[PDB]
């Protein structure tokens, strides 16, 4: 029966406004027949496959409630998403159990046939944790990014809860009863991980569709291991509440100075890019909230200039790995706490280059050609000068009080 044509007539009659009609005995017989064919649950899986091959989300819910392995088969979710389907159907399939690998393959499919609705439906399952208030799109290889996708992911407090229909659940309840009788007889999102998605630009985030009002409350944006080249300035001013911005392992070529215009930026990380050959921070920009700065493994050939006037209260200045020739301009960061110039080309530090930084505690200068150590602040606690040509312990380090 289910082999030849049972679905083609049953779904047609039960979905053609079978409710809202004084056909109580009629529905009773159809549900009796349903409970009769409900045995041999393999057949139920066949019915689900046929009910998904067509776009009839009214009865798929009933099949799922009676118990149908949504991970039966090109799995079901990839099939439904390949052909043009309805958001209700993919939602009902995601709510029921379906393998994560299948959902990932379905996301790739829906990425191919660009459809914001199914994309958001899937990302709300793969990469959203409401407890943490974080989007976790890390490593999905989404070659692009569109605000129309991340739209419904953000809470969007205007939305509410409404039971659109209940006919499927009641239908499921009565067929289950008949089978039993036959047997007896605020809270915004504060993170957005887009790392390692093989991006190439984020220009599509500008006056975004309902995402602009939500980016104003972001407090972290991991964009690392992508391949960007710039950071859109309109995004810099929109992100009015960031504290942690990550841009390492991208492909940058010059430091965007306007990054330091963000109202609350406090941990900037542009490392392992090809930035160079010199970072010049513009004196008109005053960033008193930047309490970390990682310019490691770039191609810098100087210390970032104007660092005292611009990044006033800096704590950790990490310039490891760059090719810095040799310091000549004294740092004036009154609040520095950890300097790191390891793996550079320095051969001699200027005799008063660290005298005007009275809070230095850590100072790493490995893998240089250092031979003499100049006057150091007395607060220096850790001092890691390794692999760097000292013929004798300097006299300036034997007098460090702590």
């Amino acid at each position: 029966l289910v082999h030849h044509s049972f679905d083609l007539v049953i779904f047609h009659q039960m979905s053609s406004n079978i409710m809202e009609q004084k056909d109580q005995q009629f529905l009773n017989l159809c549900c009796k027949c349903f409970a009769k064919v409900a045995m041999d649950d393999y057949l139920k899986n066949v019915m689900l496959e046929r009910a998904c091959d067509q776009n009839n989300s009214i009865m798929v819910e009933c099949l799922l409630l009676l118990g149908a392995d949504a991970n039966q088969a090109s799995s079901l979710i990839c099939q439904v998403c390949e052909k043009e389907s309805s958001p209700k159907l993919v939602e009902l399939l995601l709510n029921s159990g379906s393998r994560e690998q299948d959902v990932r393959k379905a996301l790739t499919i829906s990425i191919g046939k660009g459809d914001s609705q199914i994309i958001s439906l899937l990302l709300r399952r793969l990469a959203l944790d409401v407890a943490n208030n974080s989007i976790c799109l890390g490593g999905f290889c989404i070659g692009k990014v569109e605000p129309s996708w991340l739209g419904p992911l953000f809470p969007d407090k205007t939305s509410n809860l409404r039971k659109q229909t209940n006919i499927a659940s009641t239908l499921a309840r009565m067929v289950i009863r008949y089978q039993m009788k036959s047997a007896v007889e605020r809270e915004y999102i504060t993170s957005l991980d887009l790392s390692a998605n093989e991006l190439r630009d984020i220009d599509a985030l500008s006056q975004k569709c309902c995402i602009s009002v939500h980016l104003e409350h972001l407090e972290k944006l991991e964009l690392h291991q992508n391949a960007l080249t710039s950071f859109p300035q309109q995004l810099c001013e929109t992100l009015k509440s960031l504290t942690h911005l990550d841009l390492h392992s991208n492909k940058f070529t010059s430091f965007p100075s306007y990054l330091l215009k963000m109202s609350c930026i406090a941990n900037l990380d542009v490392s392992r890019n090809d930035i160079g050959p010199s970072v010049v921070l513009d004196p008109t920009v005053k960033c008193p909230t930047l309490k970390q700065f990682n310019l490691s493994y770039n191609q810098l050939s100087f210390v970032p200039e104007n660092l005292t006037d611009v990044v006033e209260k800096l704590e950790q200045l990490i310039l490891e790995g760059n090719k810095i020739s040799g310091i000549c301009s004294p740092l004036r960061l009154k609040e520095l706490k950890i300097l790191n110039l390891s793996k550079n080309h320095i051969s001699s530090l200027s005799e008063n280059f660290l005298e005007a930084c009275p809070k230095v505690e850590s100072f790493s200068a490995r893998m240089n050609f250092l031979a003499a150590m100049p006057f150091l602040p007395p607060s220096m606690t850790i001092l890691k000068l390794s692999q760097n040509k000292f013929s004798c312990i300097p006299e300036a380090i034997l007098n460090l009080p702590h």
């Binding site: 159990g97 994560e100 499921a172």
Partner: protein
């Protein structure tokens, strides 16, 4: 060590999160004492001690890294009592007392481990009948447990952030019901209780001396409710007084209106509200076997009879009185000393479904004690035999049966803490009499379902991996 635990993601609902690694580069901080003594080879039964140390570090969030102390005391962290017991288990000196690895994983597989948040014992062990949470979202996240211990009443006050409590006797006789009312416009908050003397007393939470006494009734007050206004009152002779929220500030206040829903042969036990917002103007109450509803005008708008239940259900359980009424799309009814739950509809005023908790329980006395609902379509059934049931309102089926944590569940409130998080307090008995107040995470049913699906997916992955390797 944590140095050997790699993380492949940070999304909680991921199939693969943590892995193990041995870089091949024991450690003093992370070794068993038997291993430190140079006694024998490492052995399986010492890895469990190392794993207990790792669990301690995860619980304390790496605090120890930067004879083990109390995790909650030495460092700041939420209790998580099931894991504290597991830690104290797998860190015992005698290695024969350490659980085997399969057992450790088996007890790490329970949703009651993730969801149980705080478990507080009461040392006095007094029979605690009622309790009311503090509707204040301030630092005074506390309860106001009412109980009966003498010819007069017993008044506890258990603070959550402190886990210590103060007891008092400020009523003239035992109390049966509590209620709290907070008027932010006047910044006044009062705790009103129903005393078996046959009166009502007010105690202002701002000052322990600001006390009043209210109008007297011939029987003992059995239930109270505050609607957010008007203060609902309920006696045992079928009386329904309304108290204005503001008028009760003064002593000897007057009831704005009084209805006699019923008679002395029928007590009024439960008053509730409709969960759906479209029906926010109906309050339901059970006077004996009458499921009556009265509108915002305090006039009865429907009057069902429950004596019809004996025609289908057993007469023995039918001729009891109503305990609770859980208002939703369908009315949920619990009757005294009855293991069966009745489901009614508002419109047709007739029975729609029955729930035989004995089936679920025997599948594992089974007397029903309390009913609670969450808008997530999970109705929590607290059975007097000390077992909680989780029913899904869409299918009316079992989710999981929670037991072996108390012997007799007394009451079960839903409440919020000062961290804006919603929890479900379960005050249960422990007759070895001892009263234990477990504070469950409101997401217990979702946790059960998600963890089941998650462990099944991981089992499938491991099975497939074993097959392709062979």
């Amino acid at each position: 060590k944590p140095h050997n635990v790699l993380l492949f993601t940070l999304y909680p609902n991921a199939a693969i999160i943590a892995k193990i690694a041995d870089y091949g580069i024991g450690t003093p901080g992370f070794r068993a004492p038997e291993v430190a003594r140079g006694n024998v080879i490492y052995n399986q039964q010492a890895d469990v001690y190392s794993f207990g140390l790792l669990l301690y570090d995860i619980l304390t969030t790496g605090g120890r890294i930067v004879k083990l102390p109390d995790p909650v005391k030495e460092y700041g962290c939420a209790p998580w009592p099931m894991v504290e017991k597991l830690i104290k288990q797998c860190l015992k000196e005698n290695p024969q007392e350490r659980p085997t690895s399969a057992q450790v994983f088996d007890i790490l597989n329970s949703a009651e481990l993730v969801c149980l948040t705080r478990r507080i014992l009461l040392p006095k062990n007094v029979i605690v009948e009622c309790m009311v949470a503090t509707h204040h979202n301030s630092r005074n996240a506390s309860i106001w447990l009412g109980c009966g211990h003498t010819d007069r009443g017993q008044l506890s006050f258990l603070d959550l952030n402190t886990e210590g409590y103060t007891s008092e006797e400020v009523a003239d006789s035992r109390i049966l019901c509590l209620a709290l009312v907070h008027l932010p416009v006047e910044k006044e908050s009062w705790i009103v209780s129903g005393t078996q003397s046959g009166t009502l007393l007010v105690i202002n939470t701002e000052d322990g001396k600001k006390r009043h006494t209210l109008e007297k009734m011939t029987d003992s007050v059995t239930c109270l409710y505050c609607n957010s206004n008007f203060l609902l009152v309920g006696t045992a002779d079928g009386k329904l007084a309304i108290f204005e929220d503001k008028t009760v500030k003064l002593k000897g206040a007057a009831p704005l209106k009084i209805l006699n829903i019923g008679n002395v042969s029928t007590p009024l036990m439960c008053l509730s509200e409709s969960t759906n917002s479209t029906e926010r103007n109906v309050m339901w109450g059970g006077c004996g076997t009458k499921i009556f509803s009265f509108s915002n005008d305090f006039t009865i708008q429907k009057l069902i009879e429950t004596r019809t239940s004996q025609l289908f259900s057993y007469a023995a359980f039918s001729d009891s009185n109503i305990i609770t009424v859980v208002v939703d799309t369908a009315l949920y009814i619990a009757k005294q000393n009855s293991p069966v739950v009745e489901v009614w509809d508002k419109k047709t005023e007739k029975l729609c479904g029955l729930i035989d908790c004995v089936h679920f329980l025997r599948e594992v006395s089974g007397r029903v004690k309390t009913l609670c609902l969450q808008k997530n379509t999970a109705l929590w059934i607290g059975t007097g035999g000390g077992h909680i049931l989780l029913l899904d309102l869409s299918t009316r089926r079992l989710i999981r049966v929670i037991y072996n944590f108390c012997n007799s569940v007394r009451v079960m409130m839903t409440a919020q803490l000062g961290s804006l998080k919603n929890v479900m307090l379960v005050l249960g008995y422990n007759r070895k009499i001892q009263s234990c107040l477990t504070v469950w995470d409101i997401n217990l049913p979702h946790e059960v379902q998600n963890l089941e699906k998650h462990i099944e997916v991981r089992k499938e992955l491991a099975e497939k991996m074993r097959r392709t390797s062979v």
